[PDB]
Write a protein that binds this ligand. Sequence first.
Ligand SMILES: [Mg+2]
Ligand SMILES: [Mg+2]
Ligand SMILES: [Mg+2]
Ligand SMILES: [Mg+2]
Ligand SMILES: [Mg+2]
Ligand SMILES: [Mg+2]
Ligand SMILES: [Mg+2]
Ligand SMILES: [Mg+2]
Ligand SMILES: [Mg+2]
Ligand SMILES: [Mg+2]
Ligand SMILES: [Mg+2]
Ligand SMILES: [Mg+2]
Ligand SMILES: [Mg+2]
Ligand SMILES: [Mg+2]
Ligand SMILES: [Mg+2]
Ligand SMILES: [Mg+2]
Ligand SMILES: [Mg+2]
Ligand SMILES: [Mg+2]
Ligand SMILES: [Mg+2]
Ligand SMILES: [Mg+2]
Ligand SMILES: [Mg+2]
Ligand SMILES: [Mg+2]
Ligand SMILES: [Mg+2]
Ligand SMILES: [Mg+2]
Ligand SMILES: [Mg+2]
Ligand SMILES: [Mg+2]
Ligand SMILES: [Mg+2]
Ligand SMILES: [Mg+2]
Ligand SMILES: [Mg+2]
Ligand SMILES: [Mg+2]
Ligand SMILES: [Mg+2]
Ligand SMILES: [Mg+2]
Ligand SMILES: [Mg+2]
Ligand SMILES: [Mg+2]
Ligand SMILES: [Mg+2]
Ligand SMILES: [Mg+2]
Ligand SMILES: [Mg+2]
Ligand SMILES: [Mg+2]
Lengths: 260, 131, 146, 159, 188
Amino acid sequence: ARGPKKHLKRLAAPHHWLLDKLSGCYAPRPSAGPHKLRESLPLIVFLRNRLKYALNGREVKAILMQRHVKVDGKVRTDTTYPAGFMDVITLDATNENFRLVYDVKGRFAVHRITDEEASYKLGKVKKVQLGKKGVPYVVTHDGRTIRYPDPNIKVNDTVKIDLASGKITDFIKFDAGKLVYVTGGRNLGRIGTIVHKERHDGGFDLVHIKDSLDNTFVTRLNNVFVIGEQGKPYISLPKGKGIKLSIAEERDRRRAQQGL
Amino acid sequence: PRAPRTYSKTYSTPKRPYESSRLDAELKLAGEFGLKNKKEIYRISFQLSKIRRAARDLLTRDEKDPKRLFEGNALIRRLVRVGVLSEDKKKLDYVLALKVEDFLERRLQTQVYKLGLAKSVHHARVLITQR
Amino acid sequence: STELTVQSERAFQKQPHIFNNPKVKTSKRTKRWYKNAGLGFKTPKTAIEGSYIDKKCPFTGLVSIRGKILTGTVVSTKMHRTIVIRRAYLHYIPKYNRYEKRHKNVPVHVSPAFRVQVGDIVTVGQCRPISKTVRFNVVKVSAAAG
Amino acid sequence: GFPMKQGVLLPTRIKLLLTKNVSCYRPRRDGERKRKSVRGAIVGPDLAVLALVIVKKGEQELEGLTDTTVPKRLGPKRANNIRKFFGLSKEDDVRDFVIRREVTKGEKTYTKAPKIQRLVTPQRLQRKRHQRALKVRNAQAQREAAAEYAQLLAKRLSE
Amino acid sequence: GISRDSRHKRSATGAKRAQFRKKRKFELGRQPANTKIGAKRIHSVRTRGGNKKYRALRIETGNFSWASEGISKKTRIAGVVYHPSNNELVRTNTLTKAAIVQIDATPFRQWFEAHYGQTLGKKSKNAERKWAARAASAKIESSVESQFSAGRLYACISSRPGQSGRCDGYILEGEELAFYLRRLTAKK
RNA sequence: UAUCUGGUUGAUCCUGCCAGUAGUCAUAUGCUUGUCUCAAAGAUUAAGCCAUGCAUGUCUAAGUAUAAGCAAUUUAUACAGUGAAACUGCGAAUGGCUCAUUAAAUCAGUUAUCGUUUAUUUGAUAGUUCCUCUACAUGGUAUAACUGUGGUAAUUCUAGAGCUAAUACAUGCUUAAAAUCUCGACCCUUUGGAAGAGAUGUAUUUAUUAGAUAAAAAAUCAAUGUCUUCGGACUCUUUGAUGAUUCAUAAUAACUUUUCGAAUCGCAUGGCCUUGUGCUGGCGAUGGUUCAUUCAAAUUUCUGCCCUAUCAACUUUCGAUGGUAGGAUAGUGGCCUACCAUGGUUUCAACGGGUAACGGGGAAUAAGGGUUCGAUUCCGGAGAGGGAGCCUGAGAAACGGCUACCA
RNA sequence: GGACUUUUACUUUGAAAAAAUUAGAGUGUUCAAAGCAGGCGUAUUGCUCGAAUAUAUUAGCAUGGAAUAAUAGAAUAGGACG
RNA sequence: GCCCGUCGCUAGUACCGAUUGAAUGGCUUAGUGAGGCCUCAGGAUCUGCUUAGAGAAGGGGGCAACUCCAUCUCAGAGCGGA
Ligand SMILES: [Mg+2]
Ligand SMILES: [Mg+2]
Ligand SMILES: [Mg+2]
Ligand SMILES: [Mg+2]
Ligand SMILES: [Mg+2]
Ligand SMILES: [Mg+2]
Ligand SMILES: [Mg+2]
Ligand SMILES: [Mg+2]
Ligand SMILES: [Mg+2]
Ligand SMILES: [Mg+2]
Ligand SMILES: [Mg+2]
Ligand SMILES: [Mg+2]
Ligand SMILES: [Mg+2]
Ligand SMILES: [Mg+2]
Ligand SMILES: [Mg+2]
Ligand SMILES: [Mg+2]
Ligand SMILES: [Mg+2]
Ligand SMILES: [Mg+2]
Ligand SMILES: [Mg+2]
Ligand SMILES: [Mg+2]
Ligand SMILES: [Mg+2]
Ligand SMILES: [Mg+2]
Ligand SMILES: [Mg+2]
Ligand SMILES: [Mg+2]
Ligand SMILES: [Mg+2]
Ligand SMILES: [Mg+2]
Ligand SMILES: [Mg+2]
Ligand SMILES: [Mg+2]
Ligand SMILES: [Mg+2]
Ligand SMILES: [Mg+2]
Ligand SMILES: [Mg+2]
Ligand SMILES: [Mg+2]
Ligand SMILES: [Mg+2]
Ligand SMILES: [Mg+2]
Ligand SMILES: [Mg+2]
Ligand SMILES: [Mg+2]
Ligand SMILES: [Mg+2]
Ligand SMILES: [Mg+2]
């Protein structure tokens, strides 16, 4: 196409943002950044779509150009910064913090969390590798490289980075029966223990996942994101605890809650 | 390059266009429910067919079918909320017996007539449109 | 196709950076590099105690096997250091609720390790464009006729 | 109205493919070359004008030229350019040496002068100091985490 | 200009194909360097995505490796003497990879003496110290030693001059040296 | 949402069409036309031609203001507010338009990069630069705008004369301590031993080397290793990723018209005491090499296209299939070349022809099965009158870029 | 306890799967085509459910099955197992 | 009664057909061959090092005596670069 595309037609846009069909021709289109543009969430979406603090688009740069918002600690002013999974986003001028942790449909929950926790976040290691000058380094999913890590951490292990200082502080291995988040695929939004990793030499290992309500299911190796010991999360989980309820069951929970 | 404001035609005209016994039957309804033209009967005729088709489909499925059960009782739930389906005719077999006037009766046309207010469907008409 | 006397080319024939110091006296007159193919493909004796060069061998050479791995049956070995496999299959035609016999010839580079001929069912593995038409490499040979 | 081009030869007009940093062309975008018509370097009768620059001054006095003399417009602006205009030294302090020119409002007269650039300022010497230190501050810190990890890995068999 | 697309080919079936699109830059090829021996002339070329290559046009004196002695000395390169690809490269003494050339023996002659202490085929204290150690390993190949007599060594270019502007090459030793020698006595 | 009816006879029952009937995101046209919402629209024929206007420009506190700009009068006699023009930087490769070409091509699902390029965003990364008397309290030139002397009927044409800036151009200092290496003065002969001299950042090019590991015991040669009971001794000794590698990474000998390692900017103006405009010092911007990330790109595996045999053999013309080497490319590869073989496709329809053919998502038609359509809102592709060629750039074979032929 | 089909077809279940469109749940755009909204209260500095689900009929990948249909194998034993 | 063919009038359609018929498009033998691009040269103009001598500086440390880094003015003469 002769080079980099810069627009985004308002339908090719990631569905989980829940933009509306009309309103205009276009969607925000993520900037280049820490997360893959289809797996991301523009700040502009968050502030005006998810948070409803803004109306215009102008009134978002309004907020952003005020440093009212910081992502993973740092002040980010880009209208369309590719904020994504495990991220924090902190609105100081209204003392609230969030965490971009998935819904159970597959969307980005407005899962508000404390000022504790906000000082850390998880990070699946994508590659761990020996850099130049004999130095080693891990590469988390969010586009962080942390040099000098524990020789114990291999790929698909998660890592508790700080947030103000880099630095890995504790880490979880990937093995039989750990608390797992699903980051994409059909089962996006789910949460549970493992049981089996089906190895397929050549490509695409598969992870059978059990939830607290005993519902086995499968995904691909990269879809899986370890987050703690069984029943013991390493972070706050949104409402519904990533369980996936059938639309039958779903019907009740709503109409039965209604009335009183 | 926007997005289409999608649309749908609401009715459908009959095949053979000159059945006398249908044109008698059709004209009758037009007079007692105060209808303007045949299209108002077609629109409903069409409605029923999608219901019967949706119905007759779920019935081919085995019961206990989460789709049949969900998407059947849902239909029934909607059909009752309007007064097309009777308070204890809540079975898919029974939605299939729904005839045209079942819908036609619940018309806010025929309701301004029924409970006083009008004492004429063709009075009920102009009563409604004249706000 | 055949097996040469190695130095049958106007260029000398050798593996890169597999140096033989003449200062030091050695039992074997040459040092043979070979590697483990992958996917449980046990590398053959011919590959190891042979003297062939072939920079296109999945062992002893600089090509790697990755992507699809295919079975087909040898149908033409008239080419040198490469053969023609044939993969047959059935195509479904939704209208007639039925099938029709199709097939595709796909050219694979055969290592001098294997000594494969017409009729031999052969397992190949994808390996990066080695030539205009070759993208697959012999990596396992099953029985013949008899 | 076609300019001569130094170095063609010819007494004719020809058509060159001109590029950037060449006479008779001025690119309207980076990488633009233009087939433009230029005139030969040899002198003929077809010139509207001929440009001469006096090298050796003659016996008599050319009234328009020799006798009069126009000022340069601007004076030095760079640090050492101020200096080597007045023949100065390293530690000589420019500042009170620049060229000032006074502006008349209507009756309200006031003066103007060049921001000296390449000037050595107390600020500039701070930036060197920062970087020069910053580099070492980090370099020692690196050794720390290095020599630490190097001892985290020692106990990865000795434990 | 040149193109390296596969599109302009026949298919294996033999079919001529219709032009599908115009030529894109990202598939171009460039003219060769055909680098000759001469005064160091090297033009560079701006390649795909910033980047440079270097067109070795004329070259004398590349960096050469005596691999079975552990050292590398910058030599002079006499002429081209063989070339498996095309004998035209020899007639025109063009330097490419796999060139087989003659190089000045005396950067290596100088190292050998000052190292092993022994003059090659015809004082001090700690100097004779190291020698007696390095000896009993000072004897080199028979076919390699003889080469120093005339002052030129048989090497083989292992760089790609039209890419990096370097004409580096290892001096031929061992069996590889036999082979090429065998060929120079059926041509040269 | 599973229906038929009219027409061959004198009458009959069949075969069989013709005609009727119904819909069409299906176009045109006729007649009629009041209201609400909704809103397609020069595709078809001519990827035919185009008057005129518009459609791509861009400045923060933070690269360059002596405008003979303006406003004030700043505390400002270096500058200091605002600021045309100009330099610099970036963008103009997105967008929008069209469907001409294209029939194994594109395209769709599914793969590959252990086969490459990647502006940017995000995260990491630099004590080594001179040298057996040096600028670093900071090197040097030139240019624009501008001024003035001009040419042409004519344009976003420009000459020659004179000024002057940089994050433009071109130069160019620098920083601890240890260690290992070769060189070896010399002395003193033995189990000998060393002064002190060099070298050692990164990147480039080549060669050599490590990068071990399924389960163990000895004999030695070549060269030098901690030692100790001066007899001879040597243990707990080190190393990552992948299904797979000459992988990541490190080491050695050198190589280089030598890559990078801040001669930049904005806010702050506090702290040590020897009081020098000494020393130190914060927040941030813009730069920078390498790696990672990201937005991409380029090739790429498997399967799948309409009519056609009044197309049966096709491919190597002048590469057709493969081998070896090279060149070339960002890299794989007959991509190109030299040399060598005679291979490659086909009735399971090759090759050739046709298409009023861009592919797909999808659309019309409601028993089912099917039938027909898709220029056109999304994705991919191609093209910018026809062809070819290239400049710039990270990205174009770009056309609101250039060059040539053709029209 | 982990890999395991002589080699296939077949069939079951999944995974990797854009939106819109289609099927279709919820929602009183005043109805409707639509849209993805909205709903509650002290309505003077708030509360609150959502934006599901099905889809896909080839090929590839993963998996439960072995009836049906192919196929391989010891005969001059150059047979199998240890 | 039905009914076949020549021959006869009118109109329409396609076929055959001298014209070494015509047009448009793709591919193409032979000959010719723009252009930018790469290359052997060229060198209007420019210019980086170097060298003996020459006119005017300041002392690496001096009883006379010696000798460095920079900056720059005209006769020259060696090697390169844009
Ligand atoms: Mg954006
Ligand atoms: Mg052959
Ligand atoms: Mg099937
Ligand atoms: Mg070519
Ligand atoms: Mg095309
Ligand atoms: Mg009759
Ligand atoms: Mg009909
Ligand atoms: Mg249109
Ligand atoms: Mg048109
Ligand atoms: Mg575009
Ligand atoms: Mg750029
Ligand atoms: Mg200058
Ligand atoms: Mg100069
Ligand atoms: Mg200059
Ligand atoms: Mg000038
Ligand atoms: Mg290892
Ligand atoms: Mg390597
Ligand atoms: Mg920056
Ligand atoms: Mg297709
Ligand atoms: Mg025909
Ligand atoms: Mg290549
Ligand atoms: Mg080849
Ligand atoms: Mg042949
Ligand atoms: Mg062929
Ligand atoms: Mg079509
Ligand atoms: Mg077409
Ligand atoms: Mg289409
Ligand atoms: Mg089609
Ligand atoms: Mg068309
Ligand atoms: Mg194009
Ligand atoms: Mg046109
Ligand atoms: Mg640009
Ligand atoms: Mg354009
Ligand atoms: Mg063009
Ligand atoms: Mg235009
Ligand atoms: Mg995918
Ligand atoms: Mg199976
Ligand atoms: Mg004819």
